Each structure stands twice: as structure tokens, then as C-alpha cells.
DNA sequence: CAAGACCAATTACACTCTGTGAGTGATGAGCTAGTTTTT
RNA sequence: AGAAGCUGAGGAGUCCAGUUUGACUGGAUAAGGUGUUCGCCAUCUCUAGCCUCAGUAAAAACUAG
């Protein structure tokens, strides 16, 4: 995919930045007024107002331009057809497991690397007279001059709709390098966002050695990425990643299994048990799911009790439907790949039956 | 005795898995190139099993550094034959020592071994990986296993 | 044109080196296998130059992990052609940039470049390495030099 | 800290010299919206 | 040698430890049992193991039998 001025005007900036092209006006950058900061723990996120032309132009950039750039198969995140289940699937053939994490990923992505990665797919031509190139015009819709970190240039924010695709595009090179290294070492490699999973089918201590860590760090140092040593995992014959258990007790061509631990399903089991105890929906909504009517934002003056009851019923409906969708997504993944424990299949079938019965009961009570 | 054939990033395959094989499996379709590529993949895999010098297959996309082929063999009947205390032949012991032993044998409790083979079926997975430098890597680093298969 | 051809640990050649090539070279001998192997080595080297997927050559002995093919080209006439001020075409500049530019930036223009402008000859050495895993390595890490040669 | 390994895709001469490579029923109605991972 | 944690602010009762006769500080209810690569891990069984306020942006898979 290659873009020109005509493609940018007629597809990407169809109406948002239409006054700039006609009246010889350079594309403005993203100001602090149109971006708001949301704090969660030690993390910050940048949200762009929908009324801003940059939001529309970056939405169309993601829809028409970033989706056509080729990626690496090891990237199982932020891609059409990608999923966490596909991120964990290739490692059923391995006997040893090693999970690594990069540092703050979107913060360590240099803007120069983004420009270099997106240069081959964008024509090297000037857009607004002999003032600004098309590269800068497109890149001004994806970055943000953050007011923190001593103002060290444009940084890819963690809350834009164009960040993940650009991250995968700029990390395609590192994915290729790491995949080549692991293929030389006979290691299956997969990546989800910034979490890297490595699986060794052979009976070797390569994944438990410091050499693997040093090689991955040296490869990541090319683009400035580091490794979070606080979340280093290196196990054998079994691994647990966020409640997903991959188990393979054997060697010389042994098929592993993927299941979910009881910790992952504990919340839904508690919800079902509470429903079986006829507990009022207020407690379940405010405790198990963490959903409330914040500061009584009812706006309209009307029968508030009925609306509150309807909200505390339909939100529970939505939670049950979402979790049953998650479980049946898992069973569809099993049907597609056949890498899930039969006992876990029976357990999730029972849980699905219980959830269906409970949602039927609560709909009847409605 | 074969249940799964998986091809990833080779010829015209991105990620294609063929399963639930029958006795009289038939192949139809307008995509003759796909059938030819599948035949080429199978022939290349069985040539590399026999340790023959052949030109490596082409990648579907060059933005990936790995081309993979997975073959899963159903080894239930041969396991039942070799694990019987009635045929102590040389070839039977060779098969038992080559494909079987270790893994689920002598690496777990006796109760697991006793209940290991009641009604279940055993599968053997073999992976061929083609790198960018025309190098072939195997999931198991034992030429005897490949020759026996 | 060409000065030396060196074959190490490939086919029937152990440390064989051929030099002092004239306009007409007559190859005689009772060992036809040697002539055939030399022809195979030359053809394999020139096929790898043009990036053709071909089966790698067999090693003389398996107790060696490397097989080398070394070609030395007498790049003296072409260097004089591309160095001359009169010739400033696209192809001449390309030849100068891809062969006679890396070796020129390392030499001082005031003394070394002036001294090298004499009757002395310049040579270009290119080595092809075959590894145990059917992998090909080159002394120069860029296809442009190989393609132009 | 500091680091080898830094993706892939992007036919041919030339001149004066013809041989040489160069010196030359229009603003009361009033409302909402999953799971998981990255984070 | 800088990376990490960490959605934040809190509150009531009770326990432990310390100082201290009188109040403060630190921790802190996903409960119990078993095995563990000892990990925030896995597995099994119940009666399911506190409450209030503030904040919640993005991209992917999933609405099956």
C-alpha cells in the first residue's frame, strides 16, 4: 500500500482537514486542549475528543491504511483474527516455557522508528506547498507532544485508536529478529502486545538459562526496548499465564493442553452461588462486578427505584452474556485446534448450563 | 494412523490444518494450485524424513522468518503391539525404545502408568521448521525417530 | 578477469587452488570426476551469485563444518574505466559505489590514493561458505556486489 | 549500564574518441448497554 | 541503577505485634484442606469469606452446539 496526496484528501481527510489543503495551510499538530489525561494506578492514558478532526482522520487512517501494511505472524494482538488463545496455542508442543515482558511499550517507541517504518508505504512528497511533507502530515495525527518526561519529542500515547497498529508495524523488525533467533535455537515464539512467550519442545535448559535473557535483551536494545525483570517466568512442564494453564508432561512429540484455573473462574462461580442463594442483585452488582450508579446521576426526575432495579438487572444480564460468550469462544477455539482438556470442557459445559439457567430465571423474574 | 497436517507460511498456505482423516478422503475444488502445494508439502516432509537433499519450499510471505509443517501420527495400535508382553522381537523393542520410553514412562508414579493405557489414544507430533537461511530444524533431535516414522 | 579459484572441503577438493589463468586454458587428466566437480563448483558459485535456489554441494569429509569457495577477480581495468573523469554515467557510478567506494574511504586521498594510481593491480575476493545446516554465508553482506559481479 | 545480532521491498556504458577507458402536528416527555488480554 | 509496583482516596468492627495506662503506628477476611518448580502456582470442598466515595481511553477475539 502506497498513499499520495489524492488518496489522503479523498479517503483519509475526506472532510476533517479539508480547509487546510485548499487555503495553503499546514496541518496543525495535536494541542493539549483536545487531549485529556486519565489516571489509573501509575499508568496514564490520552483520550482525544471525538469532535477533533484528528480523531476522525486517525480513525480513517486505521481503517484504510494501517490495516493493509504486512505484519509478522508472531504478533497475535491488535490484528484481525488475533486473540490471546492464538497467542497461547503454539506453545502446546513445548516442554519448557519462558514468559518475558517489555518495559512501558508505547512510551519507549521512538517516533523516528515510526517514521522509518511508515516511510515505505507513504510517498515522499510535499503536501502543503514546500512547507510540510506527507510524512509529517500523517504522523501529526498519530503522536502527541506529552507534557511530561521532560518533553523529549513526540510520543505514541497509550489511549489512541492508531497506537496498536503502529506499534505492531514498528515492532515487526524485532519480531522477525527474535523469531529468527528462536528458530535457530528451536524455540516457538509468540507475542501479545508486549508479552513474549517462548516454548522449547526439547529437553534443554535454554529457557531457564541467562543466555536466552541476555540475547533477548541485546536484540531489544537495537530499538531501545528493555525487559521487565519483575515479571520473568521460566518453568518446566507447566505454566500459568493470567489464569491460563498450559500443561505438557512429556517429551519427544507430546501434545500439551490449555485450560483455565479455578482462580480465573472463581468470580463467576461466586456470582452463580449468590444467585442460587437468592441474594439481592444490588450486592452482586456492587461487589462481584463493581458496577454502581455513580453519584446518583439519574439526570431526569422520575421513578428512580424502577430505573435502578432495571439497571442492576440488565447489567447482570450483560455480565452473564459476556462471560458465556467468553466460555463459548474458548470451546470454539478448542473445536478449531483441539488443545483443551476434556475435563475442562466438561466443566465449562456445566458452567455454561448453569449460566443459561440463571439468566433464563432472571429474565422470567423480569 | 495420521490425524493432523498443519502448514504455516509455506507456498500458498498461511495457517492451514487438515484433520479428521478418513479412509477414502477425496479432494475437490477449483484451486488446483492449492492441491499441488499440499502435495509438494507432503513430499518435502517425507523427503526430509528420509534425509534427502531437496530444495527448501518457498515462504508464503517474506515478513515471517519461519515456515512450519506439523504432522500428527496416531500411534495407538503400534503402542498396543509393542507394549504387549508376548512379542519380544528386535524391531518391536527398537520401536518401543525409539518413539516411546521417557516422557510418560518412568517419569511419573506407577498408578499413572497403570491407568495410562485403558481406552485413550496416543499421538506423536513432529515439526519441520524452515528458516530464512534455507536451514531445516526438527522438533525432535533424533534421526532414528524420523527414520522409524 | 579472474585470478584465483579456491575450493576447500567440497566434493573431491580438499585445499585446491587454481591460479595464473591465461587467455586459453586446457584441462587434461585421467580424473574426469575432478573436472566435473570443478565445473559443478563454478556453476554452484555463479548460481548462488544470481540468487538461485539450488541444492548445496557435498562436503569432502563430514569432520569439517565449513566448505569454502573463494573467487578472486582482477578488478583493474574496470576500476580504471570507472575512475576516469570522462566516464560519469549511471552504470559507472553504480560500479564505483558498490565496489571501489568502501576501499577508498579508508585510504587518504592526499597520499594513498595518489600512490595507488600506478601500474599495480587491484583484486576483489569473494568467499561462499556452506555450513552443515545447508546454509550459505557470504563475505559481503549485500546482494548488490554479488549481482554486479 | 551496555551489546554483536539493525525487516522487506524499493537492465543498463560513454563519448569527440567507433576503439578506449584518456590526453586529445417544526425545543416536556425520559432513559442504558458484556468477558478477557495488553494495561 | 535504573527498571518495576499501583485504579486512587477512604471508612466501621475485630485480631496480632510494638510503644504506652493511655492513645498511636504497622499489617489486614477469596474461607479451609492437599501437592508443589515455593510463585500473586495448581487442585478439591463449602455457608463463598466487609462497606462508602472518585475514576474508567484505545485495538483485537467471542453472541456455539
Question: How is the topology of this model organized?
Answer:
This is part of a larger assembly, with 1 copy of chain A (366 residues) and 2 copies of chain B (149 residues).
Chain A: H1 5-12, H2 18-22, E1 35-40, E2 43-48, H3 53-64, H4 84-88, E3 96-101, H5 105-108, H6 111-118, E4 126-128, E5 132-133, H7 134-139, H8 163-185, E6 188-192, E7 195-200, H9 210-220, E8 233-236, E9 238-241, E10 244-247, E11 257-260, H10 266-276, H11 281-288, H12 304-337, H13 342-365
Antiparallel strand pairs in A: 1-2, 3-7, 3-8, 4-5, 6-7, 9-10, 10-11
Helix pairs in contact in A: 6-8, 10-13, 11-12, 12-13
Chain B: E1 2-10, E2 13-18, H1 32-49, E3 67-74, H2 76-82, H3 90-98, H4 110-116, E4 123-130, E5 136-138, H5 143-148
Antiparallel strand pairs in B: 1-2, 1-3, 3-4, 4-5
Helix pairs in contact in B: 2-3
The structure holds 2 DNA and RNA strands.
GO biological process, one term (chain A): defense response to virus
Keywords (chain A): Antiviral defense, Magnesium, Metal-binding, Nucleotidyltransferase, RNA-binding, RNA-directed DNA polymerase, Transferase
GO molecular function (chain A): metal ion binding; RNA binding; RNA-directed DNA polymerase activity
Give the helices and strands of chain A as they follow along the chain: HHEEHHEHHEEHHEEHEEEEHHHH
Shape of chain B: globular
- The CA-CA distance between the termini of chain B, in Å, is 11 Å
Strand content of chain B: 15-25%
Rg over CA atoms of chain A: 25 Å
Strand order of the largest sheet of chain A: 6-7-3-8
Question: What's the shape of chain A?
Answer: flat
Query: Biggest β-sheet of chain B, characterized?
Result: 5 strands, antiparallel
Strand order of the largest sheet of chain B: 2-1-3-4-5
Instruction: Measure the end-to-end span of chain A.
Output: 53 Å
Amount of helix of chain B: 25-40%
The helicity of chain A comes to: 40-55%
User: What is the gyration radius of chain B calculated from CA atoms?
Assistant: 18 Å
Hey, which two chains have the biggest interface? A-B, 24 and 35 residues
Instruction: Give the topology string of chain B: H per helix, E per strand.
Output: EEHEHHHEEH
Largest sheet composition of chain A: 4 strands, antiparallel
